[PDB]
Amino acid sequence: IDLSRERDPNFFDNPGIPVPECFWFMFKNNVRQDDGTCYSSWKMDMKVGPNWVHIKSDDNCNLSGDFPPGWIVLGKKRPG
Amino acid sequence: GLKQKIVIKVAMNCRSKAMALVASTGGVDSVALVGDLRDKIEVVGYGIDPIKLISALRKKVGDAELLQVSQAKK
Amino acid sequence: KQKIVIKVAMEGNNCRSKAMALVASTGGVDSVALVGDLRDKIEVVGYGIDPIKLISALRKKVGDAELLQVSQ
């Protein structure tokens, strides 16, 4: 999987909270299922196939979490 | 306290009805149609019960699935 | 693609919910957000939104509404 050749998530930055620094992309068997934005150095709960997963982000938007087999959530910084 | 971000997938002019219904919920700051297919609602606010909102969506609009819960950072 | 910002007299009686619901249900709307410290302005973004109709609807159904901004 190569996040250079996946087009941008369709997003909306709420103007009353800070602008989240990361794009994310969710894949089942290396096929894109879903996408959006998230904060760096933070966390979010996401439905990934049948399971809720606590996803932690570091300051470079790398995403760690216990992903069910066949599924991954990958992250990268938005421009700046 | 911190603001919430909730993303809901909805079967969807159901889009207007869904947006109207979520936008009418107490503590909502914003609603946005997100995803390539505009089949997701992103809600930002405070004191939103996502279970209460999914129930209202299912009873008023159609199939609704909670995809994401997270807080605003600062 | 349009951004429209409207000041609404939203004082009391869940006038905010009423006005967010009304704007959220409008044709062409992708996003609606309460903006300003006091959350007393509404930011509407989408395609083919009629800002005249929307202002009319808000004065009819909610309270006084002023166009602060339209941009493209």
Author numbering:
A (entry chain C): 33 to 112
B (entry chain B): 186 to 197, 201 to 262
C (entry chain A): 188 to 259
Text lifted from the article:
To gain a mechanistic understanding of how the Pikh Asn261Lys polymorphism increases the association of the receptor with AVR-Pik effectors, we determined the crystal structure of Pikh-HMA in complex with AVR-PikC. The complex was subsequently crystallised and X-ray diffraction data were collected at the Diamond Light Source (Oxford, UK) to 2.3 Å resolution. The position of Lys261 results in a different conformation for the C-terminal region of Pikh-HMA, compared to Pikp-HMA in complex with AVR-PikE. However, this conformation is similar to that observed in Pikm-HMA in complex with multiple AVR-Pik effectors. To date, there are no reported Pik NLR alleles that confer resistance to rice blast strains carrying AVR-PikC. This effector variant differs from AVR-PikE by a single polymorphism, Ala67Asp, located at the binding interface with the receptor. By contrast, in the structure of Pikh-HMA/AVR-PikC, the sidechain of Asp67 extends towards the HMA, and the nearby loop containing Asp224 is shifted away from the effector, likely as a consequence of steric clash and/or repulsion due to the matching charges of the two side chains. As a result, there are no hydrogen bonds formed between Asp224 of Pikh-HMA and Arg64 of AVR-PikC. Instead, the side chain of Arg64 forms an intramolecular hydrogen bond with the side chain of Asp67.
Allelic variation in a heavy metal associated (HMA) domain integrated in the receptor Pik-1 confers differential binding to AVR-Pik variants, determining resistance specificity. AVR-Pik is one of the several rice blast effectors characterized to date, and belongs to the Magnaporthe AVRs and ToxB like (MAX) effector family, whose members share a similar overall structural scaffold despite divergent sequence.
